[PDB]
Ligand binder design. Structure first.
Ligand SMILES: Cc1cc2nc3c(=O)[nH]c(=O)nc-3n(C[C@H](O)[C@H](O)[C@H](O)COP(=O)(O)O)c2cc1C
Ligand SMILES: Cc1cc2nc3c(=O)[nH]c(=O)nc-3n(C[C@H](O)[C@H](O)[C@H](O)COP(=O)(O)O)c2cc1C
Lengths: 172, 172
């Protein structure tokens, strides 16, 4: 069980069982959101764990969440995030994505199916979860148990472009 | 050797040996940049592997790279990236960060020290590597071998805020 095997087995699940995510597994997923690095060690991530009816219903107003039993809304705090002196670019999406990716890989190791969701209505999320102006919703990570057929760990030959199309050496 | 142990051991190295990164390890790091998911499966990541003198010198014009022996410049292609219908937000930073995080964790497993770098002059990077207007430089991942004392896998009690400060349940 090494990293590449973990990364390959992970796939996007859009078919979830009713079966709830155990608290013990959730807590291990959350631990790695703290462990992850952020620019300047600023730690701008702000997470809302959503597994109860109201919250799940609120999310379903903003996005297709495939009846997943657990969601984590990952926001970034622009009052904490590092801002690059050259151009003013803030690391909000970068820091929060490292955190989300850590959680997604940890979920996978624990046998949880998952899908990363960015196709959500941000203004609905902001209203429903009463986000103040300094928090921006970035990613929603859904997790649960696959109810149908998982995608194959060997699928990437068909589902990704060749490495040579994304990598060059020294120059473009 | 599980995921949390990997995530904890990973730290930011800013003290590198002259010792080059073996090709075999580099290729395993690159493999996971392809394996990683991207929004819409659009695969907008575009990587430049930099381990030769010119390229390293070019990077050193734009950023402090701590004499690392290997760098990967991770760009995103705005002509491929998914664009959210609600607000026009592009996933450029998100997709490229998932890719970079995958590579950083894979590097760690292979015994390579690393540091993620966003404090670079983007216009210098664009000029030096002749990036066309559709590619935006997002992250520089440095890797090599630690020359001094590694940070401790148990440091997070001191180097991170408590989990309770970044996580809430159902509501803020
Ligand atoms: C940043 C990001 C945003 C995504 N947003 C959604 C989403 O809103 N809804 C969805 O069904 N899938 C979403 N996906 C899942 C992708 O469609 C999926 O990762 C990609 O097609 C590759 O498939 P795989 O993850 O099964 O390998 C997202 C993935 C990423 C990385
Ligand atoms: C998105 C991002 C950008 C970063 N940019 C730089 C950088 O430009 N230079 C640098 O020395 N460290 C940079 N870092 C490293 C952080 O300072 C470091 O991850 C943080 O202080 C936590 O320390 P640790 O990684 O040792 O746990 C960056 C880290 C992240 C996640």
């Amino acid at each position: 069980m090494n990293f590449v095997e973990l990364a390959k087995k992970r796939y996007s699940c859009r078919n979830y069982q009713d079966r709830k995510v155990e608290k013990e597994k959730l807590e291990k997923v959350l631990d790695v959101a703290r462990i992850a690095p952020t620019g300047g060690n600023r730690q701008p991530q702000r997470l809302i764990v959503i597994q109860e009816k109201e919250g799940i219903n609120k999310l379903s107003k903003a996005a297709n969440i495939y009846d997943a039993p657990l969601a984590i809304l990952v926001c970034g705090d622009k009052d904490k995030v590092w801002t690059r002196p050259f151009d003013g670019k803030q690391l909000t999406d970068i820091d929060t994505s490292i955190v989300t990716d850590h959680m997604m890989l940890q979920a996978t190791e624990l046998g949880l199916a998952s899908v990363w969701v960015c196709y959500f209505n941000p203004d609905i999320i902001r209203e429903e979860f009463s986000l103040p102006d300094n928090l921006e919703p970035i990613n929603i990570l859904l997790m649960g148990y696959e109810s149908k057929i998982p995608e194959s760990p060997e699928r990437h030959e068909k589902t990704r472009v060749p490495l040579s199309e994304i990598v060059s050496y020294e120059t473009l």
